[PDB]
């Protein structure tokens, strides 16, 4: 039996880490909802 | 048990100990969470049981105790934040550009982060709190990293 706990509010905090990078990928969604790269 | 707005850990007892099998969202008594989580089996929220009511593999989502009720969307053009729930550690909000994935069926954004599989579905948000996608679907790049789509539902 799987079971949830709050774990905090939705809101957008000012002054939070950032980072990450925006990459542009050519990919395709099979039937069984999973993404694959395409080159 | 507990119907409040906000982000929640999806946890089993299954396994070994308590695993955190991924995160979701409850907004207006619906919990919202991708399908591999859950793999739309029923929920325990302390006494109360939440049961499944619409779900979509190749979409990768679910809702349960009532219809998706998520539908914000990213604009294409500003920064958005993962609201990142990793197993055992607080929630943390992580600002970033999202990138795009390009597909035979149009462009959706992705987030760059990478968090461990049990982080799956924790909300990515706008400037305005609001939920415009679950993390959790999406590729792994040539170096190994994680990059997961902006999935969204349609709100009827
Ligand atoms: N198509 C639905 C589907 C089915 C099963 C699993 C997923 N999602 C993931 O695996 C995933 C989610 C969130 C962050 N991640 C990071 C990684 C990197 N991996 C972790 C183990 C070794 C490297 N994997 C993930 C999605």
């Known amino acids: 039996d799987m ?3 709050r ?7 000012k002054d939070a880490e950032v980072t990450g990078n925006s990459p542009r990928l050519d990919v395709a969604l099979d039937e069984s909802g999973d993404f694959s790269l395409v080159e | 048990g507990e119907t409040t707005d906000g ?6 007892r299954r396994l070994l100990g308590s695993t955190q099998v991924g995160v979701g969202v409850m907004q207006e008594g619906v919990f919202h969470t991708m399908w591999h989580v859950t793999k739309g089996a029923a ?5 109360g049981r939440l049961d499944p009511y619409w779900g979509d593999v190749k979409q990768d989502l679910v ?3 009532g219809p998706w009720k998520l539908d914000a969307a990213w604009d294409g053009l500003s920064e958005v934040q993962l609201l990142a729930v990793p197993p055992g550690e ?6 970033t550009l999202p990138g795009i994935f390009k597909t035979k069926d149009g462009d959706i954004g992705a987030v760059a982060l990478d968090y461990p599989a049990g982080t799956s579905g924790s909300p990515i948000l706008d ?6 996608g679950l993390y959790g679907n999406g590729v792994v790049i040539k170096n190994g990293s994680y990059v997961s789509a902006i999935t ?3 709100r009827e």
Do not use: F, P
Not at chain 1, 7 to 13: K, L, M, N, P, S
């Open chain 2, 127 to 132: 400037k305005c709190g609001r939920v415009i």
């Open chain 1, 3 to 5: 079971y949830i706990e």
């Open chain 2, 63 to 65: 809702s349960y105790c």
């Open chain 2, 152 to 154: 969204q539902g349609k």
């Open chain 2, 43 to 47: 929920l325990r929220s302390g006494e």
């Open chain 2, 90 to 95: 607080r929630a943390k909000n992580i600002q």
């Open chain 2, 7 to 12: 982000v929640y850990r999806v946890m089993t």
């Open chain 1, 7 to 13: 774990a905090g509010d939705i809101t957008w905090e």
